[PDB]
Structure 1
Amino acid sequence: NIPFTNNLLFSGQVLYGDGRLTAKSHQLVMQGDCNLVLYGGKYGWQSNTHGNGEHCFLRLNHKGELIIKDDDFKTIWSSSSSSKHGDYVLILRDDGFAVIYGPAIWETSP
């Protein structure tokens, strides 16, 4: 597995049981109430899926889809985003935006 970084969620990495991203005065949290909440910005945000599932978890795939599945892998919310296959990263930026970026079009070495 891949070493967590505070404000990044690379493809493959998984948040749950309120694992959370942090960046200064913001967090984005894959809670236990199955709800993906961004505390931050002026008004924050949520996937709005309060208790629409049990044991949930957020996960970004290798085609830019950011998804919340439950314990038995039922999609609870998606970003409904998709592009080429490869490594993507979600950032929690200092401005409080949470944006996905990808794929890897240039790296410093393989």
Structure 2
Amino acid sequence: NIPFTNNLLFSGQVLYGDGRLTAKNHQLVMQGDCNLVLYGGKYGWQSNTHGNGEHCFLRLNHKGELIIKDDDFKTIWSSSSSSKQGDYVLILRDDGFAVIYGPAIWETSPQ
């Protein structure tokens, strides 16, 4: 498991049951009612999926797509952003935008 960072969600990590990303003035919450909501200014946003499943969770995969699944793995919502295979990250940025970047193209390695 990858350790959690408040403003990030890496490929493989999951949120559920009111787990959320947090940054300056904003929260992106995978709520216990199956709706994914971005709280804070101006308008906010939602996936609009209240009551559509039980025990839903959010997961980012290794093609840059974010999926909401219910407990039986039925798709409730997709970002429809599938792309090249690799490691991705969802950043809830300090300016309020939640953005999926990837794949990873370069990294530091112990020397």
Q: TM-score, normalised by structure 2?
A: 0.97
- In 1, distance between residues paired with 2:28 and 2:19? 9
Contact 2:24–2:95 (CA under 8 A) maintained in structure 1:
no
How big is the shift at 1:40?
A: 2.1
- State the match for 1:71 in structure 2: 71
Deviation sequence 1:16-57 (CA, Å, 0-9, x none): 001000002100000000000000230000000000001000
Instruction: Provide the C-alpha distance between the structure 2 equivalents of 1:8 and 1:85, rounded to a whole number of angstroms.
Output: 19
**C-alpha deviation, 1:83, in angstroms:** 1.0
CA deviation map 1:63-86 (0-9, x unaligned): 001000000000000001111111
Contact map agreement 1:11 1:89 (CA 8 A) in 2 = yes
Q: Is the CA contact 1:41–1:97 (under 8 Å) kept in the aligned structure 2?
A: no
Gapped runs of 5+ residues in structure 1? none
Q: How far off is 1:60 after superposition?
A: 0.4
How far did 1:6 drift?
A: 0.6
Q: Please identify runs of 4+ aligned residues in structure 1 that moved more than 3 A.
A: none
Distance, in Å, in 2 between the alignment partners of 1:18 and 1:42 is 21
Kept in 2, the 8 Å contact 1:15–1:58? The answer is yes
The alignment's C-alpha RMSD in Å is 0.9
Show structure 2 runs of 5+ residues with no match: none
**Residues matched between the structures, number:** 110
